[PDB]
Design a protein around this nucleic acid. Structure first.
Lengths: 125, 106, 168, 118, 16, 165, 51, 217, 30
RNA sequence: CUGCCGAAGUUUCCCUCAGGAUAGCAGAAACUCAGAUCAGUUUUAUGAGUAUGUAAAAUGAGAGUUUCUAGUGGGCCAUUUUUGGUAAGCAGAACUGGCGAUGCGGGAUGAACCGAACGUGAGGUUAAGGUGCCGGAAUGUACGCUC
């Protein structure tokens, strides 16, 4: 496959109040729950299920049951962020988030530029 | 010609009812694009509208309109309750209604 | 959800017993009153002390000392079966003692169609030595290189336009 | 103060429409097994004191005026002090000459006439 | 209310 | 006779508390009236309404009263209003004339008033004065004159409860 | 007298009628501080973390 | 100028008297709550166990209708003034009352309220029985007329007389009409007519009755 | 149906099943 | 025509008979005490061998009467006891409620099952039971069993 429930795999939370955040699996409690943690301050170390996460393609080495400090240090050292964002998957998500925050005037700014973009229609004869 | 539609499309589903009783006092409106009660709080209080066409022409205008107001969310799936000045006829289950963006609060 | 309570109780002081002994047991109840009620039922059935003659001296909710350390619990229970007499012992792995008890209760209601009424929890024990773990499923969980595909991924907006990926 | 009617439809007698011998006027169902007497769901309703209208708006025309039957000029002349409460009603058997005489008198008193178009 | 001795008779664990 | 004297009602009048985002100098969409869908700049904060106009040289929406319940206060960049006076707009300034009876009609009543006859020249003097004092601000920031000239309208898949106007 | 019943909980004028004390009631009071004296008996911890 | 002047001044001095009384009662509640906390903390520290206090005040709510009830139980309902579903009454928790309650155990729910629910009830749903009539407590003068013999002169004095179980607890019931409560917002539990311990809603429930009232009220 | 019989027990069976269960319990009590 | 009050099925015995009685109920008129004057209730004490009674604390209520006078004097259902009992049901009593006079919500539908005791409406909230569609309401969340 391509997605394995590994100690040290980083997962993207898709449910709960931490939706959209990026955490890393530190431990496997059982078949339906895993312990995850993230260096981001807002996100606390906790036990989350598997319906509330999606597996990413990044696997980073990390010893079983590492504490919050060690996980953050390994995350910083191996450059997990800016590796996740390097993927076109993350870029699509960030594009969606910023496009959600556009107001009416920015929508008209989007209006005008992409109409300029459209009218190029230059193709070889 | 797409510089119009200052309303939001919706549908009339039924009256507020139990299985063997109906109360035509309030009508159940499915506001298209609304998929929960926390979202239905936005349209809570807006001006809903049922537009139809008749045979006789009053005002030289072929369109009659029955005004109404969104009153309360009804359930989990984002349906609302509406109170029209004239209770909608039972032939208008599934008929399309309009949801004006006013009285505005955004 | 369940919560773990320690309840300490004794009978009323009197000339017969001026200083009755304190009797403390840890028992799992969703609320305060259920814990006291279960305490009186347990003490009556075991020691034969009447509800009227007694009174609660201390009730305290106990939180999990390490709610983030993956632990393995062994639970001995006395199931009230069709004959009213049956014993069990089940293993669980989770982070909170209440979680193991809650998972055990759902396990009982499933594999034996039991109630909260028929279950009597003898002892919940933390087991730390790997070789002291008995059950097969939990033991195979304890291996160091655990990895498996996301089991049962399963994943209003009716009428989606494209066929779901339903895979990686 | 707006006039309010709790009910507008009259209480028709049970089965007054399937028979020409049973009349429209209300009669109380006496039968012990009558599904109408036991007031089952969906059955027609029965007159009750609960439908009584407000004492302040009872006996009032849709314009808030009480009807007073008038047969000669003397009757309307007695209505001068209640031009705000009572509207005159010309009796059916009043002659044409008296009708125009009464209606002109009532106009002079400024008292409402419901059927002045006769 | 009152006070309840515990030192003299420390609470003892009870199991079903 | 009776003429029941109404009891002394204990209801008073207090200033209307407008929304937080309905400040003077903002840009808002117009939801009702003959100019529904237009975007207009709010000049002054009236008792109940908003004295609002689109720059008449831009879109052609004269200075009008609009009730605040038919206004969507967009987060578009604010346009300064300190440069224009706004005290001359009062409720009586906008009010209708009398009627002299309950019914008046006919196309002769339509060939009169119109935006020439019953329209005073002083109103254009005020209207041109406003445009003189706002066009420099609208010209300063980009797309703004073009933004106000355009019209707001919904599209398929556009859900207003999620759109941050 | 008393055509309509008004709640003191919602109508503040009716509290002033009922309580000539809600004028100064001062609900929230600093009775803790930086100085919290954590106090749980040592053997109480022993009996709590027992069995 | 006179006559009404002395009435206003006496009216005024009565206003400070209930103000001074109310201050005294509030200090009494806070001091009682404080010593509860301190004697719990001290006992838990030095080691010996503190014990709860046998309560003398409970709130009772009838949760079943008027149909299909044994004659023994409906008789108790009459003696308790619980003649309608979703009603509510206070009862001085004692051996006679406690032993009385188990008779109607599946038909009522009871527990020990604290000061807030007492204060909310009287203020909002407090209807006084004046001259055999359900007269609301919209004024302090209404309570003064019916309890001036027992030195209760305002709503707050009544609240203390109730919440702290004074001697005039019996001398305040027939002044006060049963609390005709609404159906609880959010609903009851899924199976309302089981015992509260068994996942139902009938019976003694203690610290989890305050919740119920907030909904019912 | 799909079966050789009807799963909906006619109200006679809904009537006499419970009473015959009651007679069974009385028999154990005796 | 509307409104108001509103039982009874078994009692009190009596009978030749059907019945009455007699109550009970519903009432109708006259007159005490602001009472321990009551209670289809609990509690305490007390004797006798949780219950028993008497007496007294709790609790709610204004509590008594003498007088005359309508209608009813069935049965069904279920619970608890319960002796004779047999393949097996079955029979016997005593008690309890519900039903007769009772509509409404639910159980697809129903004399008794589950809730709920009804003036005319508005709004809000629930009971029982439900939330795939018919059908108002989550093709909800979590853990298992079952092909």
């Amino acid at each position: 496959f391509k997605r394995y429930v590994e100690v040290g795999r980083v997962v993207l939370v898709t449910k709960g109040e931490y939706t959209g955040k990026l955490a890393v699996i530190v431990d496997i409690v059982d078949h339906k729950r895993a312990l995850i943690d993230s260096p981001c301050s807002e996100f606390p170390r906790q036990v989350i299920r598997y319906g509330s996460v999606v597996l990413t393609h990044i696997v980073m080495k990390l010893p079983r049951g590492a504490r919050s400090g060690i996980v953050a240090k390994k995350w910083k050292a191996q450059d997990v962020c800016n590796k996740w964002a390097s993927s076109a998957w993350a870029k699509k998500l960030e594009a969606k988030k910023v496009r959600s925050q556009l107001n009416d005037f920015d929508r008209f700014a989007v209006m005008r530029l992409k109409k300029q973009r459209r009218e190029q229609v230059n193709v070889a004869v | 010609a797409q510089g119009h539609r200052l309303y939001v499309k919706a549908k009339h589903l039924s009256f507020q009812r139990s299985k063997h009783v109906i109360h035509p006092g309030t009508s159940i409106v499915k506001i298209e694009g609304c998929d929960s009660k926390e979202e239905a709080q936005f349209y809570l209080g807006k001006r809903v509208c049922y537009v139809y066409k008749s045979s006789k022409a009053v005002r030289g205008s072929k369109i009659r309109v029955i005004w109404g107001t969104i009153a309360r969310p009804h359930g989990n799936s984002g349906a609302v309750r509406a109170r029209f000045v004239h209770n909608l006829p039972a032939k208008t289950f599934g008929s399309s209604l309009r949801v004006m963006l006013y009285p505005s609060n955004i | 959800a369940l919560k773990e309570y320690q309840v300490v109780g004794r009978k009323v002081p009197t000339e017969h017993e001026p200083v009755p002994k304190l009797f403390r047991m840890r028992l799992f109840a969703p609320n305060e009153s259920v814990a006291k009620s279960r305490y009186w039922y347990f003490l009556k059935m075991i020691n034969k002390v009447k509800k009227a003659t007694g009174e609660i001296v201390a009730i305290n909710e106990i939180s999990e000392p390490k709610p983030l350390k993956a632990k393995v619990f062994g639970i001995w229970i006395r199931y009230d079966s069709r004959s009213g007499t049956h014993n069990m012992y089940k293993e669980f792995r989770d982070t909170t003692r209440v979680g193991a008890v809650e998972a055990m209760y759902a396990d009982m209601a499933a594999r034996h169609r039991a109630r909260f009424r028929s279950i009597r929890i003898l002892k919940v024990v933390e087991v730390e030595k790997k070789e002291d773990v008995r059950r097969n499923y939990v033991k195979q969980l304890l291996n160091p290189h655990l990895k498996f595909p996301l089991p049962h991924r399963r994943t209003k907006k009716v009428f989606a336009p494209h066929r779901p990926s339903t895979f990686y | 103060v707006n006039i309010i009617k709790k009910r507008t439809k009259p209480f028709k007698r049970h089965q007054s429409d399937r028979f020409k011998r049973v009349g429209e006027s209300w009669r109380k169902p006496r039968g012990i097994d009558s599904c109408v007497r036991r007031r089952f769901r969906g059955t027609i309703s029965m007159p009750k004191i609960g439908y009584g209208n407000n004492k302040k708006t009872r006996y009032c025309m849709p314009n808030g005026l009480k009807a007073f039957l008038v047969r000669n000029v003397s009757d309307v002349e007695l209505l001068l002090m209640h031009n705000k409460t009572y509207a005159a009603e010309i009796a059916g058997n009043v002659s044409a000459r008296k009708r125009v005489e009464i209606v002109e008198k009532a106009r002079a008193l400024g008292v409402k006439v419901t059927n002045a178009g006769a | 209310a009152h006070f309840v001795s515990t030192e003299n008779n420390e609470p003892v664990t009870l199991h079903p | 006779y009776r003429e029941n004297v109404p009891k002394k009602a204990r209801k008073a009048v207090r200033p209307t508390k407008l929304r937080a985002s309905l400040a003077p100098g903002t840009v808002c969409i117009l939801l009702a009236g003959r100019f529904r869908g237009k975007r207009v700049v709010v000049l002054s904060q009236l008792e109940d309404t908003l004295v609002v106009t689109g720059p008449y040289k831009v879109n052609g929406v004269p200075i009008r009263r609009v009730n605040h319940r038919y206004v969507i206060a967009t987060s578009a960049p604010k346009i300064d209003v300190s440069g224009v006076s706004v005290e001359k707009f009062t409720k009586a300034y906008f009010a209708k004339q009398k009627r002299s009876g309950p019914v008046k009609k006919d196309e002769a009543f339509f060939a009169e008033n119109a935006p020439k006859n019953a329209l005073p020249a002083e109103r254009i003097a005020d209207q041109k004065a406003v445009d003189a004092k706002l066009l420099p601000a609208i010209k300063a920031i980009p797309n703004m004159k073009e933004y106000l000239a355009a019209s707001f309208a919904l599209s398929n898949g556009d859900r207003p409860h999620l759109m941050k106007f | 007298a008393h055509v309509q019943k008004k709640n003191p909980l919602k109508n503040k004028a009716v509290l002033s009628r009922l309580n000539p004390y809600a004028k100064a009631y001062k609900a929230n009071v600093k009775i803790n501080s930086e100085k919290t004296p954590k106090a749980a008996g040592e053997k109480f911890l022993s009996v709590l973390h027992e069995n | 100028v006179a006559a009404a002047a002395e009435k206003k001044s006496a009216r005024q001095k009565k206003r400070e008297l209930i103000a001074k009384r109310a201050e005294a009662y509030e200090a009494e509640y806070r001091a009682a709550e404080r010593e509860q906390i301190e004697l719990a903390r001290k006992a838990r520290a030095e080691g010996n166990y503190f014990v709860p206090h046998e309560p003398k005040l409970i709130f009772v709510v009838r949760i079943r209708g008027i149909n299909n009830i044994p004659p023994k139980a409906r008789k108790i309902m009459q003696l308790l003034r619980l003649l309608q579903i979703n009603n509510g009454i206070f009862v001085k928790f004692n051996k006679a009352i406690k032993e009385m309650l188990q008779v109607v155990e599946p038909y009522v729910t009871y527990g020990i309220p604290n000061h807030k629910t007492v204060r909310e009830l009287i203020y909002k749903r407090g209807f006084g029985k004046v001259n055999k009539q359900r007269i609301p407590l919209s004024d302090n003068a209404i309570i003064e007329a019916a309890l001036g013999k027992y030195s209760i002169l305002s709503v707050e004095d009544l609240i203390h007389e109730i919440y702290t179980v004074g001697p005039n607890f019996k001398q305040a019931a027939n002044f006060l009409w049963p609390f005709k409560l609404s159906s609880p917002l959010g609903g009851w539990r899924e199976r309302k007519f089981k015992h509260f311990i068994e996942g139902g809603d009938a019976g003694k429930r203690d610290e989890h009755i305050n919740g119920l009232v907030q909904k019912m009220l | 149906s799909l079966k050789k019989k009807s799963k909906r027990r006619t109200t006679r069976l809904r009537s006499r099943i419970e009473k015959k269960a009651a007679e069974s319990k009385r028999k154990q009590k005796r």
